Design a protein around this motif. Structure first.
Motif, PDB file in Angstrom:
ATOM      1  N   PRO A  65       1.039  -1.280  -0.372  1.00  0.00           N
ATOM      2  CA  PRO A  65      -0.075  -0.080   0.044  1.00  0.00           C
ATOM      3  C   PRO A  65       0.820   1.142  -0.029  1.00  0.00           C
ATOM      4  N   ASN A 106       0.137   3.965   1.749  1.00  0.00           N
ATOM      5  CA  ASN A 106      -0.113   4.409   3.028  1.00  0.00           C
ATOM      6  C   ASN A 106      -0.049   3.214   3.943  1.00  0.00           C
ATOM      7  N   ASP A 149      -1.221   2.395   6.756  1.00  0.00           N
ATOM      8  CA  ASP A 149      -2.255   2.303   7.967  1.00  0.00           C
ATOM      9  C   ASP A 149      -2.735   0.853   7.823  1.00  0.00           C
ATOM     10  N   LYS A 150      -2.522  -0.005   6.986  1.00  0.00           N
ATOM     11  CA  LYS A 150      -2.930  -1.260   6.817  1.00  0.00           C
ATOM     12  C   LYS A 150      -1.899  -2.134   5.990  1.00  0.00           C
TER      13      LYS A 150
END
Lengths: 151, 165, 209, 78, 165, 209, 165
Positions: free
Chosen positions: B45, B47, B49-50
């Protein structure tokens, strides 16, 4: 609840007990054994001396009686008249019959929620006490209203 | 016969960093399908965040058949999609390198400029001249993202995507 | 809202069913004392058939068309063999479960929400109660009609209005091959299925005292 | 709301008559079950003493009982 | 058969950030449909003032059929479309980073300017040189919007859009 | 405006219907006392037919065509069987459902709007009341004419100008199979419907005193 | 049958802001058609002087039918086309942000300039250097319009456009 009446119209056991106690205080014999109900009244309280007539005050008492009777549900009401021995048998029987007819007619004029009313009188042929010294004041002369609870 | 988009549990045994895609394997331990394994890959990803895992090639024993029902992973007992790992790997290193290179540039140039109004001169020399190359290289390498990495000892939850038999 | 109503209905039904079954178990022996099919079972383990009697029948097809009769009799279930006589178990007892899984993430937060939750639960409770009462009423009606049918069949058989089931048995001696052997084969057959007679002349009346 | 007031209290509801029974041996005036002798003289709804309300939702505002007799009173007008 | 544009209740049980679209499942818990599940995904609007779910993949138990009625979600007993989550996620971090970088640049340059009218020089150094790289990087990364993240313990209200059989 | 008119008319009609229904229930016994039916009912639970008449009949068909008659008599509905006698309940009762959906497009805002709303409600009340009266009048006329037709048929039959109905009955003994039995089959039917006769000789009149 | 260009009434029971399109449902309250549902969508005008709803997917109860009469809304008891909401949602916020950014720029630069004719220098620093980035960002984001929001308990009137059967 806003559709089906939860109880019969104008019903209050408190009022029932209250006026039953009041009638017993006034002296009217009230008997409730099983589902058969009896109310007995001395003849002197309503009629004059062997007289098939009504004093004006008696109408208030009859009003109270009718108000009490309005509460129940019934089918048949029987009214019986008993008197004291005065001259003959036929005279007493006729007096009892006339008194019963009068009281029955007034009761029917009142909103007695019933279906059949029987009326009769038997003079002094069914005594209730050996002591008979008194005349119409004697308790032997009387009027009885009897019926059975209609579920 | 399997519902359209139902729940299942699996046991994950191997880990990897989110740096090089490659074959990865997990084991379904419960449900009707027993002793079954599932191989696939992951995604990278933009970002941090996951982090999720792509699992499609299902190897089920009993018959030498290989269904390819595609499925992913969720955080166990959390009902969330994020990865239980670290994400602050390479913020501080690049921040410090850049700021130190800038400080060197500034120190040399400013202490040379304020000369009018030998060791200090040597300090000016070193800072002013070695700051620039360090600063440009640090700006070149500053674009490195912070990676994430799963662990090889945590179970996982798998939601179905297509029906099989 | 409606979820609270439905779950209350379920809970009330379950609770009422448990209460009624518990009471039925609590008072038990008199039930089997009253209901004894075994006392009625005939000499060859045959369940006597069931009869239904109607009185003062009249039906209209249309104008100028009415059909009237005094009494009618109908056969409900033909007689058949049975190993063990039935009981009140298969009629009066009813299933019991306890639903204890309210998927309620919609907890009533406001005071009025809690109040309406409560009132809907109450109406569900009473709805389940009356449902259970109706179910029990239907079951007891069913068992009553079966028992009455059997009793009426006995009455008519005494009266000589029906036909007793004619039975026969066929016997065979030593039977089987050299590997399997049965001792005394017996086969049971019924010929005359119990049915009503039509020759009214044969009817014999009865007068008590 | 008390039914067996001025007494020892209620005892229980008997469904044979749909009636309440107090602590003393008296049948209370109150009812408990719908399966009791009531006193109905006035009824709501429409298509009374007719085929009832026809099930179909018609576009028109007129409603006709299932016997073919119409109920303009139950219907609206203009 | 389902009415054209009526209301149904559903339970949302799994949580996820509005960062990576994927399979999300909810459960219809009342009405004629009992125990049915509904999978779909989400969308990201330009502004974080709302959040909605696109839901089409409907799987009803009892029989093995997969209808595709499409519908969205509203907050039950709210009659609105907003999502109960955070909306102010990423303002202050970037604001402060940019403003600190600018303040550094300004401090270095102005305290260098005020020389005409060693520790002060070093302050000039650090501020004037580390402000600029941080300022340009902050201008680069200042464009990331504020995300939203649904939670795993709130239901939803589903208004129908098309009919079924 | 017209919306207020319509809602007022609805309310007035419903209110007047409720009032007339409750007063009709108030005066109950004398109603069926007058509109007895079992007395008119025949001896085989047959509803007697309905007869209508007219006096001093005249029809001008067109120019150059005139026809006159003393009286005419017509049969409305042929007689038929009946189980329970009818009553005024299905003749004079009007329905009542209280409308409780107040919603109007143009709610009054100005003083003129409010006063016209009030007066429109008033006139709607009046219109509903008179329309309900009209409905009651139609119903009472209908039931009265049916009762009069029944009376007319009975008395004309007494006058011996119409054919009395003819009823046939057939009896069969026990019927049914060995599983179903009926004691006594009885078929009742109507063969000759009542009708008028034209033979002038069989006309007997009456004279009072 | 509906006459071309007459007036019906319905009640809106759900609210939503004019930020993202979606399905919006209303219910006809009275008249020939009772309890009918009506789902449609809205439009976003150039200016917030009004807001209108396009209602096309109208389902009548009773039978399995769904006609597609399209019609709009009028303001109840106003006989107008406006919407009841607020319109100053994000005017002063962006106005003040831009004005403050410019004020920062000016304070720093002018108080640096007026020096010839340390804390004051630091104020000059902060204002003169953080004003510019905020000014450009505010000019970037100043263009977001003020949204409007319908209400979940307000009725409405709908004028028809075409006939149906």
């Amino acid at each position: 609840v806003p559709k089906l009446p939860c109880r019969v119209d104008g019903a209050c056991d408190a009022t029932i007990i209250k006026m039953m106690t009041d009638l017993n205080k006034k002296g009217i014999k009230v008997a409730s054994v099983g589902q058969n109900y009896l109310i007995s009244i001395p003849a002197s309280a309503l009629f004059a001396d062997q007289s098939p007539r009504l004093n004006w005050a008696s109408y208030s008492l009859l009003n109270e009686i009718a108000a009490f009777l309005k509460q129940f549900r019934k089918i048949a009401i029987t009214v019986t008249s008993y008197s004291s021995k005065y001259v003959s048998v036929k005279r007493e029987r006729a007096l009892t019959l006339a008194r019963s007819r009068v009281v029955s007619e007034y009761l029917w004029s009142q909103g007695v929620d019933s279906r059949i009313i029987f009326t009769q009188g038997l003079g002094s042929d069914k005594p209730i006490t050996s002591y008979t010294l008194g005349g119409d004041r004697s308790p032997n002369a009387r009027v009885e209203i009897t019926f059975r609870r209609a579920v | 016969i399997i519902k359209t988009g139902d729940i299942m549990f699996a046991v994950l045994d191997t880990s990897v960093n989110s740096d090089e895609p490659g074959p990865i394997l997990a084991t379904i331990v419960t449900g009707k399908l027993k002793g079954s394994k599932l191989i696939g890959s992951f995604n990278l990803p933009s970002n941090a965040d996951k982090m999720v895992i792509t699992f499609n090639t299902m190897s089920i024993p009993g018959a030498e058949k290989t269904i390819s029902i595609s499925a992913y992973a969720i955080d166990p007992n959390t009902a969330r999609t994020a990865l239980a790992s670290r994400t602050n790997h390479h913020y501080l290193m690049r921040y410090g390198s850049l700021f130190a290179s800038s400080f060197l540039q500034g120190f040399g140039n400013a202490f040379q400029s304020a000369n009018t109004t030998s060791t200090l001169e040597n300090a000016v020399i070193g800072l002013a001249t070695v700051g620039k190359a360090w600063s440009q290289q640090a700006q070149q390498l500053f674009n490195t993202p912070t990676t994430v990495e799963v662990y090889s000892g945590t179970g996982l939850g798998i939601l179905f995507t297509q029906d099989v038999t | 809202k409606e979820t609270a109503l439905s779950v209350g209905a379920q809970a009330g039904l379950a609770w009422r069913a448990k209460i009624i079954d518990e009471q039925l178990n609590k008072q038990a022996r008199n039930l089997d004392a009253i209901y004894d099919f075994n006392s009625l079972v005939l000499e060859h383990n045959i369940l006597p058939p069931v009869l239904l009697e109607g009185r003062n029948t009249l039906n209209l097809a249309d104008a100028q068309s009415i059909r009237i009769s005094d009494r009618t009799y109908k056969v409900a279930k033909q007689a058949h063999f049975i190993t063990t006589p039935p009981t009140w178990r298969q009629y009066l007892w009813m299933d019991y479960v306890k639903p204890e899984a309210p998927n309620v993430t919609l907890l009533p937060k406001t005071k009025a929400e809690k109040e309406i939750w409560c009132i809907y639960t109450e109406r569900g409770w009473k709805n389940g109660i009356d449902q259970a009462n109706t179910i029990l009423e239907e079951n007891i009606a069913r068992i009553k009609e079966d028992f009455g049918g059997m009793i009426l069949y006995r009455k008519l058989l005494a009266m000589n209005m029906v036909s007793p089931p004619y039975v026969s048995h066929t016997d065979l001696g030593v039977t089987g091959d050299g590997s399997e052997i049965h001792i005394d084969d017996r086969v049971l057959r019924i010929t005359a299925l119990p049915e009503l007679n039509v020759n009214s002349a044969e009817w014999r009346a009865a007068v008590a005292k | 709301d008390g039914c067996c007031s001025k007494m020892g209290g209620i005892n229980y509801c008997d469904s044979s008559a749909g009636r309440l029974v107090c602590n003393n041996g008296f049948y209370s005036t109150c009812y408990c079950t719908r399966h009791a002798v009531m006193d109905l003289q006035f009824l709501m709804g429409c298509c009374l003493w007719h085929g009832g309300v026809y099930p179909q939702l018609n576009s028109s505002g007129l409603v006709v009982c299932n016997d073919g007799y119409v109920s303009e009173e139950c219907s609206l007008q203009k």
